[PDB]
Write a protein that binds this ligand. Structure first.
Ligand SMILES: Cc1cc2nc3c(=O)[nH]c(=O)nc-3n(C[C@H](O)[C@H](O)[C@H](O)COP(=O)(O)OP(=O)(O)OC[C@H]3O[C@@H](n4cnc5c(N)ncnc54)[C@H](O)[C@@H]3O)c2cc1C
Length: 498
């Protein structure tokens, strides 16, 4: 049926948009292809942990997979599973695997919670048409408050066994003249301290994050989406995937929407129409919908920039072997708290998470997720034969990202007399994982596929809200930027258009 506003997806861009629409009195329907994650499963928990993955871990796969970096220790717990509407989707393209969340809350369900504002000078470089003063004065603060960002207690961090891994990398980086920074988070650090004291059920301290956190993590279902539902003007329909978008002959937009069960069986195909249409299906999902609509003729006035300008936020994973005297600990919180900030906006820039590992026994490995500045971009092209967007990215396009990560970690290895691990990402010698992405950015870039507020070029009352807007790189973990930009955009849209 008809609803004034439809929001596709329930990640960061979608959740912000729906809250503000509802507060403005606009009846809004959110369509989410994944589940509402609120049913206790066979272990009594909503989500599986990293040491007990089951079908809940995976979006329609037939075998569980180890978290990247941990195959050597966690393959032993992998099992065959029924294809199911699980929470983490590894989306495989030709030469890149992009990991995304599936469910009410999108990537907020599966992410590490790291809530980081980009460097203002870098923001100004990547988005020169946007007023940076409003962003830093108004929208970034609004996002940090709404997201429930909080900060780890430094004394607890210094003392706890659960962050030994972070302190070891801090010390090693320091010998190379590199400093660390604390990373704010949406995981409640007060709750985490109580986990360590045995006072509340563990989640971060029980090897949970990438398949969801049963406690502690303030994902969007608890923050923006709860508030959106609280307006009385927003509803969310789950296991509903939008397939096609057209402009109706009488104005507005019409969607074909498939309803499935959790086994992926098609239950119904529905037509849903609206006056205002907001895409929050992610870098992958929003871009796919729009390239499909352009190339199948249902939104024929979309421009050539739709599909373009994708990058993986310079994501590279690597690992160092510590000296025997620098164990990283068997007990590592699943939520990172420290990063190495070597980002100066130059091509050598690196901002690297000090990543925990879930093995639960001593391995001496330090793991890092580097964010780099690599100008290479890919393009989503529509394949009409299979009705899918394909991402034209090649592995060699990550060479500059590998080079920057390697130059930084080579400094740390030189200062400490350590070497890389070469065995964490497959049997072939490979110290740098260069074909994954947790932070997909672009495909519907702000100001190129859209105007400076995400209004899709060629169309009225059609908006993109999410990571597809960002031009490939933000230099930090991206969700705070997506959230703040979405706050800016929807406020202007409600004022001028609605
Ligand atoms: C393992 C992992 C760790 C991460 N750690 C961090 C971190 O610590 N900090 C950080 O800043 N970022 C982190 N990220 C990245 C962050 O989660 C994403 O940048 C963010 O979630 C993107 O928000 P979005 O609104 O663009 O889309 P998403 O959050 O991806 O949400 C899109 C939603 O739309 C739904 N959807 C897609 N297509 C359709 C359709 N056709 N119809 C209906 N629904 C649809 C999806 O199922 C999903 O729920 C991490 C990501 C991963 C994979």
């Amino acid at each position: 049926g008809y609803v004034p506003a439809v929001v596709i997806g329930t990640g960061y861009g979608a959740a912000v948009s729906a809250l503000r629409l509802g507060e403005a009195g606009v009846q809004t329907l959110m369509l989410e292809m994944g589940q509402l994650w609120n049913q206790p499963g066979p272990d009594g928990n909503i989500f599986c942990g990293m040491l007990n993955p089951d079908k809940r871990s995976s979006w329609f796969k037939n075998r569980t997979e180890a978290p990247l970096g941990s195959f050597l220790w966690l393959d032993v717990v992998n099992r065959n599973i029924d294809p199911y509407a699980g929470v983490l989707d590894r989306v495989n393209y030709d030469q890149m695997s992009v990991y995304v969340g599936r469910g009410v809350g999108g990537g907020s369900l599966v992410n590490g919670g790291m809530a980081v504002e980009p460097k203002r000078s870098y923001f100004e470089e990547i988005l020169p048409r946007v007023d940076s003063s409003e962003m830093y004065d108004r929208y970034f603060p609004r996002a940090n408050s709404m997201l429930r960002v909080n900060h780890i207690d430094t004394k607890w961090f210094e003392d706890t066994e659960w962050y030994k891994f972070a302190r070891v990398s801090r010390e090693q980086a320091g010998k190379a003249g590199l400093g660390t920074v604390f990373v704010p988070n949406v995981y409640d650090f007060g709750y985490m301290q109580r986990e360590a004291a045995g006072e509340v059920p563990k989640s971060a301290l029980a090897t949970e994050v990438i398949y969801g956190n049963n406690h502690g993590k303030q994902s969007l279902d608890k923050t923006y989406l709860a508030a959106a539902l609280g307006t009385g003007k927003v509803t969310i329909q789950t296991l509903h995937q939008v397939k096609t978008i057209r402009q109706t002959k009488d104005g507005g937009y019409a969607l074909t929407v498939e309803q499935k069960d959790t086994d992926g069986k098609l239950l119904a195909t529905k037509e849903i129409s609206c006056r205002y249409l907001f895409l929050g299906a992610g870098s992958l999902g929003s871009t796919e919908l729009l390239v499909r609509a352009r190339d199948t003729g249902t939104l024929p006035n979309l421009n050539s920039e739709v599909g373009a300008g994708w990058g993986p936020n310079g994501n590279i994973m690597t690992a160092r072997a510590n000296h025997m005297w620098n164990p990283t600990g068997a007990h590592q919180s699943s939520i990172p708290a420290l990063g190495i900030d070597a980002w100066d906006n130059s091509d050598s820039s690196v901002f690297a998470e000090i990543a925990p590992m879930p093995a639960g026994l001593e391995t001496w490995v330090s793991l890092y997720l580097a964010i780099t500045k690599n100008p290479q971009r890919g393009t989503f092209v529509y394949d009409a034969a299979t009705d899918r967007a394909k991402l034209n990215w090649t592995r060699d396009q990550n060479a500059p990202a590998v080079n920057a990560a390697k130059a930084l970690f080579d400094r740390i290895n030189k200062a400490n007399g350590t070497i890389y691990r070469y065995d964490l990402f497959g049997t072939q010698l490979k110290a740098f994982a260069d074909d994954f992405c947790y932070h997909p950015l672009g495909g519907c870039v702000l100001g190129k596929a859209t105007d400076d507020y995400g209004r899709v070029a060629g169309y009225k009352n059609l908006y993109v809200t999410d990571g597809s807007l960002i031009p490939g790189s933000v230099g930090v973990n991206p969700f705070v930027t997506i959230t703040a930009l979405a706050e800016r955009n929807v406020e202007r849209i409600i004022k001028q258009d609605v």
